[PDB]
Amino acid sequence: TNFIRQIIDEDLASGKHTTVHTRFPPEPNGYLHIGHAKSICLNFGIAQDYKGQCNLRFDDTNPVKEDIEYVESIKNDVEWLGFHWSGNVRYSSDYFDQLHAYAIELINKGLAYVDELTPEQIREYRGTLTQPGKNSPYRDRSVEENLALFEKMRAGGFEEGKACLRAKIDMASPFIVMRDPVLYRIKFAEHHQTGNKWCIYPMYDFTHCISDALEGITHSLCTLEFQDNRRLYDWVLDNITIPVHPRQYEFSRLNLEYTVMSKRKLNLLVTDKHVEGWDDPRMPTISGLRRRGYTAASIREFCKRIGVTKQDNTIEMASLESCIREDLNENAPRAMAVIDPVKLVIENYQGEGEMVTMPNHPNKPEMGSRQVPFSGEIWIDRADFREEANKQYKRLVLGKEVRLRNAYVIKAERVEKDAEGNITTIFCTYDADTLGVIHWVSAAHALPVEIRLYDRLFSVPNPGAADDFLSVINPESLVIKQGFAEPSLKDAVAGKAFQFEREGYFCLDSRHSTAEKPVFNRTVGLRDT
RNA sequence: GGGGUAUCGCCAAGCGGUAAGGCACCGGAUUCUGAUUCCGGCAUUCCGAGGUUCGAAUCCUCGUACCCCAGCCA
Numbered sequence: 059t060n061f062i063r064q065i066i067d068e069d070l071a072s073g074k075h076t077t078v079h080t081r082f083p084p085e086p087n088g089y090l091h092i093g094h095a096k097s098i099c100l101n102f103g104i105a106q107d108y109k110g111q112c113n114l115r116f117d118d119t120n121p122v123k124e125d126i127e128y129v130e131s132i133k134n135d136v137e138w139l140g141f142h143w144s145g146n147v148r149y150s151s152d153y154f155d156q157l158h159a160y161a162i163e164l165i166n167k168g169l170a171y172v173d174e175l176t177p178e179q180i181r182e183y184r185g186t187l188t189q190p191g192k193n194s195p196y197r198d199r200s201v202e203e204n205l206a207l208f209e210k211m212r213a214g215g216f217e218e219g220k221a222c223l224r225a226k227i228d229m230a231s232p233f234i235v236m237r238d239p240v241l242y243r244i245k246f247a248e249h250h251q252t253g254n255k256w257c258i259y260p261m262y263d264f265t266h267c268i269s270d271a272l273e274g275i276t277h278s279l280c281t282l283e284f285q286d287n288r289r290l291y292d293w294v295l296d297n298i299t300i301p302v303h304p305r306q307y308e309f310s311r312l313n314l315e316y317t318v319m320s321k322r323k324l325n326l327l328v329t330d331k332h333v334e335g336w337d338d339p340r341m342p343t344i345s346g347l348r349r350r351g352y353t354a355a356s357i358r359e360f361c362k363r364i365g366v367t368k369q370d371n372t373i374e375m376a377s378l379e380s381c382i383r384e385d386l387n388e389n390a391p392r393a394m395a396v397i398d399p400v401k402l403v404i405e406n407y408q409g410e411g412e413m414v415t416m417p418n419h420p421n422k423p424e425m426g427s428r429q430v431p432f433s434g435e436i437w438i439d440r441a442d443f444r445e446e447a448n449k450q451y452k453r454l455v456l457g458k459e460v461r462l463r464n465a466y467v468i469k470a471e472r473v474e475k476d477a478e479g480n481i482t483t484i485f486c487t488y489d490a491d492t493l494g495v496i497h498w499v500s501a502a503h504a505l506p507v508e509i510r511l512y513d514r515l516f517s518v519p520n521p522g523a524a525d526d527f528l529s530v531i532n533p534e535s536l537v538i539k540q541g542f543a544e545p546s547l548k549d550a551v552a553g554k555a556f557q558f559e560r561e562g563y564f565c566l567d568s569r570h571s572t573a574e575k576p577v578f579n580r581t582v583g584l585r586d587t
Numbered sequence: 588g589g590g591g592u593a594u595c596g597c598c599a600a601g602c603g604g605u606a607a608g609g610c611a612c613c614g615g616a617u618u619c620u621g622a623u624u625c626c627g628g629c630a631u632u633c634c635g636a637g638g639u640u641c642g643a644a645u646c647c648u649c650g651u652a653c654c655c656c657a658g659c660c661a
C-alpha cells in the first residue's frame with residue numbers, strides 16, 4: 059500500500075472507477091534505468107493487483123532525439139522484468155492525426171494561435187518566476203488566419219522556429235506552464251515511425267493527456283517535476299471534445315548513491331566511451347544490471363522495498379545489493395574460483411590426484427553435489443596466506459594449518475619468493491585422513507578465467523551534483539583479474555549466477571566470455587565484516 | 588511568485604490515542620564459505636515555536652530547511 063493505491067481504492071469504493079488502467083510511457087531516447095524499473099513496477103504492478111490493464115507507450119514526439127534502437131531495447135527490458143502490457147505497443151505518433159485535429163478544435167475555439175515570435179523572443183515575452191509575461195503581438199489573429207497559418211506550418215511553408223502553434227491561456231499565470239504553452243513546433247526531421255509525413259510535431263503537454271484519454275487510462279502516474287504540468291494537462295482535456303478525463307498523480311523519482319539516473323548523463327558516458335555501452339555492467343540501466351548479474355526478481359523486490367511516496371530520496375547502494383544477495387544466497391549454486399592465484403604444492407601428496415565431493419549448496423542438500431578434482435599442486439588466493447599475521451587471521455599461516463574447502467587440512471612450512479621478494483610457491487603437507495578455511499583449485503584441472511571485479515562507477519555519493527560529473531568517475535569501477543576456476547564452470551551458462559565461495563556472486567557472458575577464454579562478472583561481493 | 592515535501596544513518600508505516608517494518612549498525616549463538624541462519628539492542632520522539640484537546644506525529648498559527656518550474660525537451 060502507498061498513497062496511490064489508496065487513491066485507487068477510494069475511486070473503486072465511491073464508484074468513480076470500476077477498473078484501473080495505467081501506463082508506462084518512456085521516450086525512446088535512451089535505455090531504461092533502475093528508475094524506470096520503479097515506474098514499471100508501479101504501473102504494471104497496480105494493473106495486475108487490481109485485475110486491470112497497463113499499456114506500454116512510447117512517447118515519441120521529438121524525432122531528433124529518438125531512435126528505433128531504443129524502442130527495441132525498451133520492449134526488451136520491460137519483458138525481462140516480468141511484465142506484460144495491454145494489447146499492442148502504443149506510440150504517441152499513432153495519434154498525430156488525432157492531435158492535429160484537436161489542435162484545430164482549439165484554434166476554432168480561439169484557444170490557440172500561430173505565433174511568429176522567434177525562439178528567443180518567446181522567452182523574452184514569457185516573463186520570470188516573479189514577473190508576469192506579456193501577450194505576443196500575434197496573439198489575437200482571427201480563427202481563419204490561425205487556421206491558414208497552421209496549415210502553412212503543416213505544409214512546410216515555414217522554416218524552423220519561424221512559427222509555432224501556442225495555446226491561448228494566461229501570460230500572467232503564476233504557473234509558468236500556463237503562459238501560452240506551445241502545442242506545435244516545426245522540425246524537418248524524419249520520424250522513426252512516421253518517416254517524413256510530418257514536419258510539425260506535438261509538444262509533450264499537449265500529447266500526453268490526449269494519449270492517456272484516448273487509451274482510457276484511469277490513473278496517469280508520473281514523477282514530481284510534472285506537478286505544475288498537471289494544470290496544463292487538465293486544461294487541454296477540459297477544452298477539447300473528449301469523453302474521459304484521466305487524473306494525474308505524481309510520486310518522487312528514484313535516486314541511487316554513487317550513480318547518475320539521468321539519460322543525458324548516461325548518454326554522455328556512452329557517447330564519450332567511458333563505459334562500454336548502455337549495458338555496461340557498471341551502468342544503472344536495466345540491461346546493465348542484467349549483464350551485471352542481477353535477477354529481475356531482485357529488482358522487483360528492490361522497488362517493493364523502497365516504496366512509493368512524494369518525498370525526495372536517495373537510496374543507498376547497500377539496499378540494492380541486499381536484494382540481490384538475498385536472491386542469490388538462496389538459489390545460486392556454489393563453486394571454487396581463485397581470483398588472485400599463487401601456487402601451493404603439497405610435497406606430502408602422492409599421485410596425479412583424486413576426486414573430492416563438494417555440495418552444490420551447503421544449507422541446501424536438495425540442490426545435489428558434484429565431484430571436484432583435488433591434487434598436489436593447487437591454486438589459492440594470495441590473500442589467504444600469511445607468514446605471520448595477528449591472532450584474528452583465521453587463514454593459512456607459515457607454520458600453522460588451515461582446512462582446504464571440502465578437502466584436507468594442510469600445514470604451510472616453507473614459502474619461496476622471487477626477485478622482488480614476491481612469493482611464488484607455498485610448500486605445505488596434508489593429512490592422510492582429514493575429511494579457518496579457504497577455497498582452492500587444482501592447478502592441473504584449472505580453467506583459466508578472466509574475472510571482472512566491478513565497483514561503484516563514481517567516487518562520490520551524488521556525482522549528478524558535481525560541476526563535472528565525468529571528472530568524478532571511479533578509476534577502479536572495473537578491475538580485471540586473470541584467475542583459475544574449477545573445471546566445473548566449463549559449462550557455465552551466460553546469465554546464470556554462481557556463488558564463488560568466500561568471494562561473491564559471479565556470472566558469465568560479460569559480452570566477452572568465449573569458449574577458449576571465459577569471462578565472469580562479479581555481480582556483488584559477499585558481506586565481509 | 589507558484590507548485591511540492593519535511594518521522595531513527597538511508598528508505599518508510601502511522602490519517603487524534605499516546606511511534607510498524609526494511610536496509611545499515613552494535614552484541615551473542617550456530618556454521619569446514621570470517622557467508623548464510625539465528626536470538627538480543629537500537630528515535631520517552633516525529634523540522635521549530637505557540638495554540639485547541641483528557642489526549643496529537645496525527646487539527647490550527649506563525650516560522651525554518653530542502654526539491655521543482657522562466658526548452659519551439661520529456
Ligand SMILES: Nc1ncnc2c1ncn2[C@@H]1O[C@H](COP(=O)(O)O)[C@@H](O)[C@H]1O
Nearest residue numbers: 083084085093094096097280281311312
Ligand atoms: N528516476 C526515476 N524514478 C522513477 N520513475 C522515473 C524516473 N525517471 C523516469 N521515470 C518514469 O518513467 C517514465 C518515462 O521516462 P522518460 O524516458 O523520461 O519519458 C516517466 O513518465 C516517469 O513516470
Ligand SMILES: NC(=O)CC[C@H](N)C(=O)O
Nearest residue numbers: 083084085117279280661
Ligand atoms: N506524464 C509522464 O509520466 C510522462 C513522462 C515523460 N515521458 C518523461 O520523460 O518522464
